[PDB]
Design a protein around this ligand. Structure first.
Ligand code: AG
Length: 72
């Protein structure tokens, strides 16, 4: 079964962030549906636990260069 994580992504300056983030993350193994937002400053990612995790996703966002932290 799949899970979904809301990662708060702060330091998003404009929609280039949205585009780049969703572009990169959509290609990660296990990822399915994705909804990244400038306005809400976050990334709502549906994923497969066995192939990726909230920490992996958060990690990648942090590597790109944003303040990536889980909603909980
Ligand atoms: Ag931007």
């Amino acid at each position: 079964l799949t899970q979904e994580t809301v990662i708060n992504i702060d330091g998003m300056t404009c929609n280039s962030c949205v585009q780049s983030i969703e572009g990169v993350i959509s290609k990660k193994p296990g990822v399915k549906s994705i909804r990244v937002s400038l306005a809400n400053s976050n990334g709502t990612v549906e994923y497969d636990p066995l192939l990726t995790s909230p920490e992996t996703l958060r990690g990648a966002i942090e590597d790109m260069g944003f303040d990536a932290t889980l909603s909980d």
